[PDB]
């Protein structure tokens, strides 16, 4: 793979039928969540992450803009995912801080379900990285 930058999409379990502010945004912005995502253990290999250079903390926050844009009470989980030809590498190291080496990586299709401030995103982002197949 190459470590690269691409246009992501969002997915949620939002209800089409109802008025809670960003249920309303998500129904017009995101797709439904697949109840069984893929999680593939990296055998053996290690890669270098950098929460500070992650252009998922660059597209997130632009969707948070359009969220409030039309917004004006409970948040639900939103997932961020990659298109064909790309995939998300996830760091499973427990004393990982955000940067440097990470021996236990795995690949995921979408991120975890995120409660909704760049720093609040990075509080959960840290372990995610995009590469191109």
């Amino acid at each position: 793979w190459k470590d690269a930058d691409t246009t992501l999409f969002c997915a949620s379990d939002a209800k089409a039928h109802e008025t809670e502010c960003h249920n309303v945004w998500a129904t017009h912005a995101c797709v439904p969540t697949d109840p069984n995502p893929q999680e593939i253990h990296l055998e053996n290999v290690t890669e270098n992450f950098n929460m500070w250079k992650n252009n998922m903390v660059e597209q997130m926050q632009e969707d948070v803009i359009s969220l409030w844009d039309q917004c004006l009470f409970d948040p639900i989980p939103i997932h961020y995912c990659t298109p064909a030809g790309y995939v998300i590498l996830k760091c499973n190291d427990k004393n990982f801080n955000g940067t440097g080496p990470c021996k236990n990586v795995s690949s995921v299709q979408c991120t975890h379900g995120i409660k909704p401030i760049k720093d609040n995103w990075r509080s959960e982002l840290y372990k995610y990285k995009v590469v191109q197949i």
Epitope: T7, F9, A11, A29, V31, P32, D63, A84
Partner: antibody, heavy 123, light 109 residues
Framework: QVQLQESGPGLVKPSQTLSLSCTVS??????????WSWIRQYPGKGLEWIGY???????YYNPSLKSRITISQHTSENQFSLKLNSVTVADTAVYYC???????????????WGQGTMVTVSS | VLTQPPSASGSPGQSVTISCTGT?????????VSWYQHHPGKAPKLIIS???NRPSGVPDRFSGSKSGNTASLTVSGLQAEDEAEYYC??????????FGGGTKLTVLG
């Protein structure tokens, strides 16, 4: 690379039931988080959204089609289809299949289209 | 359900603008206006998405906008290859879409 090929009848009798098939070829079908849509153009007129179905199996038809309509998928052979019922001469149009995206910067637009196939209703 | 003018013309080099009038629940209720270029007997090309966003491989000179309920597409610096028919669509309500009648952009020869 991902193109959309629509197959189907040219002619159908009134009151019958058109059904068209669109074959993806690049390219995902099931694989992606897109929407797989049917759009017809009345030559001139003229353009109208029929409905689409999502990789998850979620259908979304146009409200103005009072149950005259179902859409479905073959995750297998990377193709999908519309079945329009009780057709009258009104339903005579070119039918395009298209891929709807919910990627950011392309939200609720139709990035990939099919070249179109002409369908004529007549007794 | 959206409203465009039938024709729109300009000579080579000039700049041309195309209206697309909706309602407060169509355009002006959502920033999901799209524009499609349709050459005859060929598959329509998407050229503007989310109001004013050029996809990859779509030239610098096409541009979108909306004022209130009237979206608008501009083509700066005409060339022969721009002569075609242009439609606009907008998202509307829980999963629904509307289009315009289409506008014939004639590059005057």
């Amino acid at each position: 690379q991902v193109q959309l090929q629509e197959s189907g009848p040219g002619l159908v009798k009134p009151s019958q039931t058109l059904s068209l098939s669109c074959t993806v070829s690049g390219g995902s079908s099931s694989s992606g988080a897109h929407y797989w849509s049917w759009i017809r153009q009345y030559p001139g007129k003229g353009l109208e959204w029929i409905g689409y179905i999502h990789y998850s199996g979620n259908t979304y038809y146009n409200p103005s089609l009072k149950s005259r309509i179902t859409i479905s998928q073959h995750t297998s052979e990377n193709q999908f289809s519309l079945k329009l019922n009780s057709v009258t001469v009104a339903d005579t149009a070119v039918y395009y299949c298209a891929r709807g995206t919910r990627l950011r910067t392309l939200r609720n637009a139709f990035d990939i289209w099919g070249q179109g196939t002409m369908v004529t209703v007549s007794s | 359900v959206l409203t465009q003018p039938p024709s729109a013309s300009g000579s080579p080099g000039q700049s041309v603008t195309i209206s697309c009038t909706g309602t407060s629940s169509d355009v002006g209720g959502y920033n999901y206006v799209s524009w499609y270029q349709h050459h005859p007997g060929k598959a329509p090309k998407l050229i503007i998405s989310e109001v004013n966003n050029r996809p990859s491989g779509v030239p610098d000179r096409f541009s979108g906008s909306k004022s209130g309920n009237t979206a608008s597409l501009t083509v700066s610096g005409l060339q022969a290859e721009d002569e075609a028919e242009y439609y606009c669509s907008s998202y509307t309500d829980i999963h629904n879409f509307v289009f315009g009648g289409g506008t014939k952009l004639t590059v005057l020869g």
